[PDB]
Amino acid sequence: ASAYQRFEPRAYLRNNYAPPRGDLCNPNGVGPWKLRCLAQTFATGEVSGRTLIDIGSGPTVYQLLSACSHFEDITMTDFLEVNRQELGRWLQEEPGAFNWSMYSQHACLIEGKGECWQDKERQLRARVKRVLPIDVHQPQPLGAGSPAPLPADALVSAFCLEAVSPDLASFQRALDHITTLLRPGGHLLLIGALEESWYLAGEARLTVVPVSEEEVREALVRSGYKVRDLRTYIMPAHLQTGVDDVKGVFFAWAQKV
């Protein structure tokens, strides 16, 4: 884990959410695919409630753009203080915040409600109530007496579990840990890297457990979920850049039973 102490948010953001990966004009790219998975899932109207927790948010907000209109109380989390600060800069509109507006605009485009991207960002900022430390390796990831309303009605988590677990067994336990935060009958939207073993974040070099779609499906089942949806995006050559060795991205919609 000590590897994460060198994690640089700006390098991470540049590596994954600036062009080419962060170019949203091409409908066949990874960004549009991710936003589409999230928007379509929420458009079913089956993922609803009052409170939601985003697990391992890092310095990003794209994962909550479609979610925020369905949950009035949102908790964002990360293991690193520098990531929580980076989030704070965007949430508070402070100087030097990352520019997420391309993602916000595309979410509005995809959702098709004629919403301006400014209203969308306003709603997300308003509904994110708190940003908390978290460690998915702990039986109680949020600790003993957290300000977060528990259990949550829904969880979101993108590119975290596989990125912090040495092997499949560790991946499984981490999922078990965060699953305790979710109310029975609640929903988990999980996004992650397929068959990845490393990625870079400035001076940090992070180890990743390479997982397959079937392995993800089986882990969700073992954690007591019914898998409602599980899709794969295969990474095209033009998005394989040397910041990592990712082969694909998965999206899972799972419901706790």
Ligand X SMILES: Nc1ncnc2c1ncn2[C@@H]1O[C@H](CSCC[C@H](N)C(=O)O)[C@@H](O)[C@H]1O
Ligand Y SMILES: Nc1nc2ccccc2[nH]1
Nearest distance in Å: CB 255, ligand X? 21
Nearest distance in Å: CB 208, ligand X? 9
**Residues contacting 85, CB < 8 A, separation 6+:** none
Q: What is the residue-wise DSSP string for 161-212?
A: HHHH-SSHHHHHHHHHHHHTTEEEEEEEEEEEEES--EEEETTEEEE-----
Can you tell me the distance from the alpha carbon of 153 to that of 149, in angstroms, rounded to the nearest whole number? 9
Q: Which among ligand Y, ligand X, a copy of itself, none contacts residue 164 (Cβ within 5 to 8 A by kind)?
A: ligand X
∠ CA(184), CA(187), CA(192), 5° rounding?
130
Q: Is 63 near ligand X (CB under 6 A)?
A: yes
∠ CA(98), CA(31), CA(120), 5° rounding?
55
Q: Is 147 near a copy of itself (CB under 8 A)?
A: no
Q: What is the residue-wise DSSP string for 82-137?
A: HHHHHHHHHHTT-TT----HHHHHHHHHHHTS---HHHHHHHHHHHEEEEEE--TT
Q: Is the dihedral of CA 54, 59, 63, 67 positive or negative?
A: positive
Q: Is 73 annotated as a binding residue?
A: no
Can you tell me the distance from the alpha carbon of 196 to that of 207, in angstroms, rounded to the nearest whole number? 9
Can you tell me the distance from the alpha carbon of 216 to that of 158, in angstroms, rounded to the nearest whole number? 13
The residues in 14-53 that bind ligand Y, with binding defined as CB under 6 A, are: 16, 21, 30
**Number of residue whose CB is nearest ligand X:** 58
Q: Which among ligand X, a copy of itself, ligand Y, none contacts residue 134 (Cβ within 5 to 8 A by kind)?
A: ligand X
Contact string 12-51 vs a copy of itself (x = CB under 8 A): ------------xx-x----x-------------------
Dmax over Cα atoms in the chain, in whole Å?
46
Among 10, 89, 125, 137, binds ligand X (CB under 6 A): 137
Q: Which among ligand X, a copy of itself, ligand Y, none contacts residue 246 (Cβ within 5 to 8 A by kind)?
A: ligand Y
Among 24, 249, 252, 254, binds ligand Y (CB under 6 A): 249
Can you tell me the distance from the alpha carbon of 33 to that of 240, in angstroms, rounded to the nearest whole number? 16
Q: Is 106 near ligand Y (CB under 6 A)?
A: no
Q: Which residues are annotated as a binding site?
A: 12, 17, 56-57, 62, 78, 83, 135-136, 158, 196, 244
Q: Which residues are annotated as a binding site for S-adenosyl-L-methionine?
A: 12, 17, 56-57, 62, 78, 83, 135-136, 158
Binding site residues, a copy of itself, CB under 8 A? 24-25, 27, 32, 105-106, 108-110, 112, 114-119
Binding site residues, ligand Y, CB under 6 A? 16, 21, 30, 159, 193, 246, 249
